[PDB]
Amino acid sequence: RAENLWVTVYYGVPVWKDAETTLFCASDAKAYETEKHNVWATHACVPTDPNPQEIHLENVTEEFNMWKNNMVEQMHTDIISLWDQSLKPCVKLTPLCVTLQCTNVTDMRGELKNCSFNMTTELRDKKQKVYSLFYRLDVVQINNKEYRLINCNTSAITQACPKVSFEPIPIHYCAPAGFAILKCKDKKFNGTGPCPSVSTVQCTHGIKPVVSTQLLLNGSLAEEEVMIRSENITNNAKNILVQFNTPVQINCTRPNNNTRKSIRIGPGQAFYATGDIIGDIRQAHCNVSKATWNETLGKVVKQLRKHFGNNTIIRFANSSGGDLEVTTHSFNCGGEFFYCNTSGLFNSTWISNTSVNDSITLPCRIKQIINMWQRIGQAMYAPPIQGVIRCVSNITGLILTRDGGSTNSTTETFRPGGGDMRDNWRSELYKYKVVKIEPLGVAPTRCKRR
Amino acid sequence: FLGAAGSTMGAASMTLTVQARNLLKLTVWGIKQLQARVLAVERYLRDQQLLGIWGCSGKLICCTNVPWNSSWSNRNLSEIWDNMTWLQWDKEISNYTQIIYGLLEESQNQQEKNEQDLLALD
């Protein structure tokens, strides 16, 4: 009757709403040729498209929050769920809780313990008198010197398979049909607020799931100025994530050339014991070049003054205290798990623009039996590695905390953070968020129908 | 692919077609690469069933006999296609969206096909 237009259905209109879905992984279809019996994640893991597509959306402004990002939570539970699936088929070490008779190794206060103990053979009749070599961190005495496994009173224990490797490989997160992933292309982005230039991708960039504390290793570099990120900045309870401009060369080696016993606890099962150490008598150490660490510090200390004020004193110091995972730099190199003393790097005091040799070193401790992510009921034994392990990684960022003692208007001190591994994933995921596409739409037009 | 999302609705009608489309024996992660694509085909058919039961029965664009109510975004035609964008458009209709949906399935394909059956007898 009254004119004019009529409703009309449009399919595929550009309308999306912020939402959450279940994301899968992608390995680049080369990681599969890397083989070594299912390295890390990739087994049936989806091959990445040789030509990923990134579409820049013009005349668009979208508001991002990285701390509210849901992609982080899936990845955190993924690595955890990934971890258990790796330890299920492997050999369980349950009857290793046998009494340990230990003694001091032939310098640096006997960090290594030579332990003799009784063990079950293939046959169920006669036991086996054999010795092994454990770090001081893996054992605890109970009251010659008698020791025991450190994890036995807390939980059970299982050995990781020598076939698989913990080597981080690039993993692309993609979204299923009907969804989309937004990417923030600005050079300077702190993870909160509106984003001027936004592009969309089916898959996120190459992300190496490197689990580390107090140091972001093998991560993505920032653009131009170094970045400063915090959930709540003025709040001293929230950690402060830092993104580096130039990568920092770091060396961590295992200056112990070792051998594998490969003792037989059959039928069919074989445990890899740590034999005698042939080589340098040394404790594990981590190298950082004095010139390269300082330059970054000088550029970073200036960025904190875009918040804490033009002029103020910023002092750095080592970890306050807590669990070993919190107080030291924890990571994996060559299959072994290093815990490094970062106290030497964080000893400095800075002026407004400045601070008042050719190398630096960091003492590292080795622990084979670990419970990360506060896991109880499952302890993983890192198998020994033949020969000396040497590794070189990039230091791409930090986890930092601010002191609560204030004296807020006087000076501020920062210390290396730890704990939550989500922050590590938030470091790479800050520029991405998940939305679902709503294709269906209605618009008024004259066509009507016959 | 979404390129006109920032552009006006009038320009957004040209690229409409691109938006339509972009061992397996594992015990675990097999459910992770499955559960995602299964709800995808469930979400896919969810939209398509609506397209059939309405006056469309076909994809892309299709029209209907439902008259546009003035009370629903009273506007200028050039104020819609030429001056306005889809994200900005779906924002206002958000209240009347469920109302419009009813007019397509009820007022049309329920009352139209029956109307058609009566017009097909003679």
């Epitope: 709403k17 912020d18 402004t61 979208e62 508001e63 929050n65 909160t192 607020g193 509106p194 959930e231 709540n232 | 009370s71 629903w72 975004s73 009273n74 506007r75 994200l87 900005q88 924002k91 206002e92 209709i93 958000s94 209240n95």
Partner: antibody
């Protein structure tokens, strides 16, 4: 939670310039939160002055250019602060001024409508009495 | 530039009563962009309902909005003591936002 604490009572004479500040407590940033300045004449209704949104200052055609709204984000020593300056003060400006904010993160929220929006959080208010 | 008209400017109502305060806009507002505020004397105004029917979180269920075209109305059932004060209607439909005359809800006795 969200708390907006404004400056003290300002009594200034005509022709002078007045600056009020709004300290926004509980707000993570002004990127996800738009700030609007609204005044209320005594015994009269409310009037929209201006806003700062996505770090872009804006104001009504009444006050265009005569009103300046500036804001700095969350710092290490204090919460996010916004400031309003009014030069060429007159006797008709004696309204009570309010510092307001609104959550813009929800893109399909009914709070906002492309710059023009409602006001979720209200401040303590600041009275400006202009008299010679 | 929209102009908001409220009726009445003030009213006398008792406790338990159902109070209806209407408002009319100089033009037709669709998408229903309209807000209602409550202000107790001497205190800053608080946001109650946005988009005309949408009640804010933490607000009692006794408050109800209605929005159609040029004519808008806010309905309050079971009036109580804390509800008394001055109420305002606001349109964010177009730049800039404009408020209403205001309505003073006054105790009956």
């Amino acid at each position: 939670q969200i708390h907006l604490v404004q400056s003290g009572t300002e009594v200034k004479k005509p022709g002078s310039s007045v600056t009020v500040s709004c300290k926004a407590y509980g707000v993570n940033t002004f990127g996800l939160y738009a700030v609007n300045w609204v005044r209320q004449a005594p015994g009269q209704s409310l009037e929209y002055i201006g806003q700062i949104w996505r770090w872009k200052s804006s104001a009504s055609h009444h006050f265009r250019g005569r009103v300046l709204i500036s804001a700095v984000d969350l710092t290490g020593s204090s919460p996010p602060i916004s400031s309003l300056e009014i030069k060429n003060l007159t006797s008709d400006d004696t309204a009570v001024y309010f510092c307001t904010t609104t959550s813009t993160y929800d893109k399909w929220s009914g709070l906002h409508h492309d710059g023009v929006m409602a006001f979720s959080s209200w401040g303590q208010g600041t009275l400006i009495s202009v008299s010679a | 530039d929209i102009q908001m008209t409220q009726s009445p400017s003030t009213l006398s109502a008792s406790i338990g009563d159902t109070v209806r305060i209407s408002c009319r806009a100089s033009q037709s507002i669709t998408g229903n962009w309209v807000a209602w505020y409550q202000q107790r004397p001497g205190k800053a105004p608080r946001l109650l309902i946005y988009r005309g029917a949408a009640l804010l979180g933490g607000v009692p269920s006794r408050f109800s909005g209605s929005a159609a075209g040029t004519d808008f109305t806010l309905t309050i059932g079971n009036l109580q003591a804390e509800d008394f004060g001055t109420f305002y209607c606001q349109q964010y439909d177009t730049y800039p936002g404009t408020f209403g005359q205001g309505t003073k809800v006054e105790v009956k006795r």
